[PDB]
One Martini backbone bead per residue (centre of mass of N, CA, C, O) as a GRO file, in nm:
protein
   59
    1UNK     BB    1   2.250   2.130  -0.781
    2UNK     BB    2   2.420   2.390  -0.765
    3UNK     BB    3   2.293   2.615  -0.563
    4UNK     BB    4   2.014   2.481  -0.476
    5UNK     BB    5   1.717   2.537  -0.431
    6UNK     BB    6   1.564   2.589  -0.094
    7UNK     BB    7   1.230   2.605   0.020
    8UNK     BB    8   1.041   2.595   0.345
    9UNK     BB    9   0.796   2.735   0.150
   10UNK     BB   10   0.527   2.490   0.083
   11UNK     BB   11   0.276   2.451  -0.155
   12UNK     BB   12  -0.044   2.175  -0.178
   13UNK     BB   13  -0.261   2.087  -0.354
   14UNK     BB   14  -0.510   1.874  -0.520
   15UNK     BB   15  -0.326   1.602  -0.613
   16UNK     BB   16  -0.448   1.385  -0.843
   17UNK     BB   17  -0.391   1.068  -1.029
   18UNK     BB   18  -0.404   0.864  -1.275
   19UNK     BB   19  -0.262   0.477  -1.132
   20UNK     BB   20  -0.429   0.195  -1.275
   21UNK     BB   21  -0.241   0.076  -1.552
   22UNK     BB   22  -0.184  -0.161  -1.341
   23UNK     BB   23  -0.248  -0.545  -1.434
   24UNK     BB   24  -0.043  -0.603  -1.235
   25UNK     BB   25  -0.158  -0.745  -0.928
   26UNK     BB   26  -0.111  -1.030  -0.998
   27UNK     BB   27   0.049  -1.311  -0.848
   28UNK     BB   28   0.043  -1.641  -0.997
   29UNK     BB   29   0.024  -1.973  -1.114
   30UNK     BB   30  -0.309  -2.124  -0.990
   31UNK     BB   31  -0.484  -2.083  -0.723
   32UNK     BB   32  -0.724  -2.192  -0.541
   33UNK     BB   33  -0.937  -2.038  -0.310
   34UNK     BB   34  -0.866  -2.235  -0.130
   35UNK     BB   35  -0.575  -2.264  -0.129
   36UNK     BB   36  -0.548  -1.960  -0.039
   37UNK     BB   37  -0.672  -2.006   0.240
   38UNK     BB   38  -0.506  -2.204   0.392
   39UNK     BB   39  -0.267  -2.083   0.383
   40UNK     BB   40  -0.346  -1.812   0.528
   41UNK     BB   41  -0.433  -1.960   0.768
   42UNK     BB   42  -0.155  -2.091   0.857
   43UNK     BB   43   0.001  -1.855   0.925
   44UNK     BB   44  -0.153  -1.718   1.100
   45UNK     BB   45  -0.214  -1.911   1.319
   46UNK     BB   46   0.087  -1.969   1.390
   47UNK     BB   47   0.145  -1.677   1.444
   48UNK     BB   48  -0.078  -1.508   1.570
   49UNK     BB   49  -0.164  -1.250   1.409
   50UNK     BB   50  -0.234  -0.910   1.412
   51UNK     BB   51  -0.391  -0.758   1.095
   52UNK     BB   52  -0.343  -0.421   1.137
   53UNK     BB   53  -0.456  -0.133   1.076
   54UNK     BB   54  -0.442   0.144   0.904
   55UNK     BB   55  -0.464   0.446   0.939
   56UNK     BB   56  -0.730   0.723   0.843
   57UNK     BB   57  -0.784   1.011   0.694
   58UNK     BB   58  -0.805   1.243   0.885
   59UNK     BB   59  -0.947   1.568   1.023
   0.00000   0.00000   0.00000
């Protein structure tokens, strides 16, 4: 927007809110537990990839 507002001095208090009416978070056709369990075993030890975790929000 024109000539638009723009303060460098910004603060957020504690604001979380339910985002979790997405329902639709599984996708595939039919894979039994078995079968994704070998294909992921499959890429995972191919690739010889380590699944390293993303840090926790630390004090």
């Amino acid at each position: 927007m024109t000539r638009g507002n723009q303060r460098e001095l910004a603060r957020q208090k504690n604001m979380k809110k339910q985002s979790d009416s997405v329902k639709g978070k599984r996708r595939d056709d039919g894979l039994s537990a078995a079968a994704r369990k070998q294909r992921d075993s499959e890429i995972m030890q191919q690739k010889q990839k380590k699944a390293n975790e993303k840090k926790e929000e630390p004090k």
